């Protein structure tokens, strides 16, 4: 805004696992206020991955989001360093967008699939991160 700065909107942690990151991803997944269906999808994916490979769901999700998180951006065109909140937001948006275009029937198992793909290193979100890195390198000199 022109005048003054608005404080960040506090988001209550996820009741089950007490993770603000999980709550933020859940809200990213939500559509039309259907929080119950979003919760079902996210908890189901976390439980599936935990059962498949024995790892703490919160730790694994944080580690994967770290890999998928970007590093640089360009603003209208001059490169700039992304802020921590925008980093996480872009990462989660990229994961959900790539899942939207994935070819599997459902969304929860199809989200777990992309989580494993990103953990391995090959995925649409990682490709988009590499593309933004390339474009930032191309416009590096400015600023």
């Amino acid at each position: 805004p022109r005048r003054r700065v608005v404080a960040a909107r506090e988001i209550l942690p996820d009741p089950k696992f007490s993770s603000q990151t999980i709550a933020k991803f859940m809200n990213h997944v939500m559509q039309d206020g259907k929080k119950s269906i979003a919760e079902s999808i996210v908890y189901g994916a976390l439980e599936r991955v935990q059962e498949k490979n024995k790892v703490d769901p919160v730790e694994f999700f944080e580690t994967t989001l770290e890999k998928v998180r970007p590093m640089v951006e360009v603003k209208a065109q001059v490169p700039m360093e992304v802020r921590p909140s925008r980093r996480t937001a872009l990462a989660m948006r990229w994961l959900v967008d790539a899942a939207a275009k994935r070819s599997e029937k459902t969304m929860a198992l199809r989200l777990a699939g992309e989580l494993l793909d990103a953990a391995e290193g090959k995925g649409a979100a990682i490709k988009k991160r590499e593309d933004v890195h390339r474009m930032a390198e191309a416009n590096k000199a400015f600023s």
């Binding site: 191309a138 416009n139 590096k140 000199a141 400015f142």
Partner: protein, 117 residues
């Protein structure tokens, strides 16, 4: 084939383009690159990035002759004059000195007329 230990670098920076020519002593040419030639063919030829790319490619090409120390002479105005020496340092040349050689007439020939834009 020829091997030389020391050389000079000339940066012709203008308002539309930047030329980087690496020569030996006595002015015999060894390599040359241009901001417009190294892609970026548009109004971006004058941007600092194109000059940096040109300097990088010129230095990489000139490394074949085993040049480790370079002297820098810079001519004229234009963005990208500073980027050339930075790119040379990045590629690894040790810059002995940097000097400016822009000509200054002592009220000689009449310049063109003023643009009315």
């Amino acid at each position: 084939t020829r091997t030389v230990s020391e050389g000079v670098a000339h940066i012709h920076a203008s308002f539309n383009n930047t030329i980087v020519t690496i020569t030996d002593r006595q002015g015999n040419a060894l390599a040359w690159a241009t901001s417009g030639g190294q892609g970026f063919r548009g109004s971006r030829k004058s941007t600092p990035f194109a000059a940096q790319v040109a300097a990088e490619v010129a230095g990489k090409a000139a490394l074949d002759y085993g040049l480790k120390n370079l002297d820098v002479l810079v001519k004229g105005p234009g963005p990208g004059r500073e980027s050339a020496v930075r790119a040379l340092g990045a590629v690894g040349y040790k810059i002995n000195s940097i000097t400016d050689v822009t000509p200054i007439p002592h009220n000689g020939c009449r310049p063109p007329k003023k643009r009315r834009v």
